[PDB]
Amino acid sequence: TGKNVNVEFDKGQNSARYSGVIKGYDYDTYNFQARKGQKVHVSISNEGADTYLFGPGISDSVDLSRYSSELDGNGQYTLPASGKYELKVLQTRNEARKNKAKKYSVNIQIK
Ligand SMILES: [Cl-]
Hints:
111 residues; Jelly Rolls; 9 strands; globular; binds chloride ion; signal; Gifsy-1 prophage protein
Protein backbone atom coordinates (compact mmCIF):
# COMPACT_ATOMS: atom_id res chain seq x y z
CA THR A 1 0.00 0.00 0.00
CA GLY A 2 1.16 3.50 -0.89
CA LYS A 3 2.76 4.90 -4.02
CA ASN A 4 3.03 2.68 -7.09
CA VAL A 5 4.97 3.64 -10.21
CA ASN A 6 4.89 1.39 -13.25
CA VAL A 7 8.47 1.64 -14.53
CA GLU A 8 8.26 2.71 -18.17
CA PHE A 9 11.49 3.20 -20.06
CA ASP A 10 11.31 5.34 -23.17
CA LYS A 11 13.12 5.35 -26.51
CA GLY A 12 16.56 3.71 -26.52
CA GLN A 13 17.25 3.85 -22.80
CA ASN A 14 17.76 1.00 -20.34
CA SER A 15 17.25 3.03 -17.17
CA ALA A 16 14.93 5.57 -15.58
CA ARG A 17 15.36 7.83 -12.57
CA TYR A 18 12.58 8.52 -10.06
CA SER A 19 12.17 10.71 -6.98
CA GLY A 20 10.05 10.37 -3.86
CA VAL A 21 9.47 11.44 -0.28
CA ILE A 22 8.76 8.80 2.34
CA LYS A 23 7.98 9.33 5.99
CA GLY A 24 8.64 6.86 8.81
CA TYR A 25 7.64 3.32 7.83
CA ASP A 26 5.92 4.26 4.54
CA TYR A 27 7.39 2.82 1.37
CA ASP A 28 7.18 3.44 -2.38
CA THR A 29 6.88 0.66 -4.93
CA TYR A 30 8.28 0.58 -8.46
CA ASN A 31 6.91 -2.15 -10.69
CA PHE A 32 8.55 -3.55 -13.79
CA GLN A 33 8.35 -6.45 -16.22
CA ALA A 34 11.55 -8.28 -17.12
CA ARG A 35 12.88 -11.37 -18.84
CA LYS A 36 14.84 -14.06 -16.98
CA GLY A 37 18.58 -13.42 -17.26
CA GLN A 38 18.29 -9.66 -17.56
CA LYS A 39 20.35 -7.74 -15.01
CA VAL A 40 19.02 -5.05 -12.70
CA HIS A 41 21.04 -2.33 -11.00
CA VAL A 42 19.48 0.16 -8.58
CA SER A 43 21.22 3.18 -7.08
CA ILE A 44 19.79 5.51 -4.45
CA SER A 45 20.87 8.97 -3.31
CA ASN A 46 19.94 8.52 0.35
CA GLU A 47 21.80 6.05 2.58
CA GLY A 48 18.88 6.08 5.01
CA ALA A 49 16.71 4.20 2.50
CA ASP A 50 16.81 0.52 1.56
CA THR A 51 16.04 -0.79 -1.93
CA TYR A 52 14.56 -4.29 -1.87
CA LEU A 53 13.47 -6.38 -4.86
CA PHE A 54 10.52 -8.81 -4.81
CA GLY A 55 9.22 -11.10 -7.51
CA PRO A 56 9.11 -14.54 -9.13
CA GLY A 57 12.06 -16.82 -8.34
CA ILE A 58 12.78 -14.78 -5.22
CA SER A 59 11.60 -16.53 -2.04
CA ASP A 60 11.73 -13.49 0.26
CA SER A 61 13.52 -10.47 -1.23
CA VAL A 62 16.84 -9.34 -2.67
CA ASP A 63 18.81 -6.44 -1.20
CA LEU A 64 19.94 -4.35 -4.20
CA SER A 65 21.74 -1.65 -2.17
CA ARG A 66 25.38 -0.99 -3.10
CA TYR A 67 27.08 -3.03 -0.36
CA SER A 68 24.73 -6.01 -0.63
CA SER A 69 26.46 -9.37 -0.95
CA GLU A 70 23.68 -10.34 -3.38
CA LEU A 71 25.12 -8.11 -6.13
CA ASP A 72 27.95 -9.21 -8.43
CA GLY A 73 31.19 -7.29 -9.06
CA ASN A 74 29.37 -4.84 -11.35
CA GLY A 75 26.67 -3.87 -8.86
CA GLN A 76 24.09 -5.99 -10.73
CA TYR A 77 21.63 -8.77 -9.87
CA THR A 78 20.47 -11.35 -12.43
CA LEU A 79 16.69 -11.80 -12.52
CA PRO A 80 15.90 -15.49 -12.01
CA ALA A 81 12.55 -15.52 -13.83
CA SER A 82 10.39 -13.72 -16.39
CA GLY A 83 7.52 -11.65 -15.05
CA LYS A 84 6.56 -8.80 -12.78
CA TYR A 85 8.98 -7.50 -10.15
CA GLU A 86 8.65 -4.89 -7.40
CA LEU A 87 11.39 -2.60 -6.16
CA LYS A 88 10.45 -1.11 -2.83
CA VAL A 89 12.10 1.96 -1.36
CA LEU A 90 11.73 2.15 2.42
CA GLN A 91 13.59 3.77 5.29
CA THR A 92 15.93 1.62 7.36
CA ARG A 93 14.23 0.56 10.59
CA ASN A 94 16.63 2.70 12.63
CA GLU A 95 15.73 5.74 10.56
CA ALA A 96 11.98 4.87 10.40
CA ARG A 97 11.79 5.19 14.23
CA LYS A 98 12.27 8.94 13.91
CA ASN A 99 9.08 9.42 11.86
CA LYS A 100 10.79 11.97 9.61
CA ALA A 101 10.26 12.51 5.89
CA LYS A 102 13.25 11.72 3.70
CA LYS A 103 13.58 12.64 0.06
CA TYR A 104 15.38 10.26 -2.30
CA SER A 105 16.25 9.70 -5.94
CA VAL A 106 16.47 6.18 -7.33
CA ASN A 107 17.96 5.05 -10.64
CA ILE A 108 16.65 1.78 -12.02
CA GLN A 109 18.61 0.08 -14.78
CA ILE A 110 17.51 -3.15 -16.47
CA LYS A 111 19.83 -4.63 -19.11
CL1 LIG B 1 21.30 7.67 -7.60
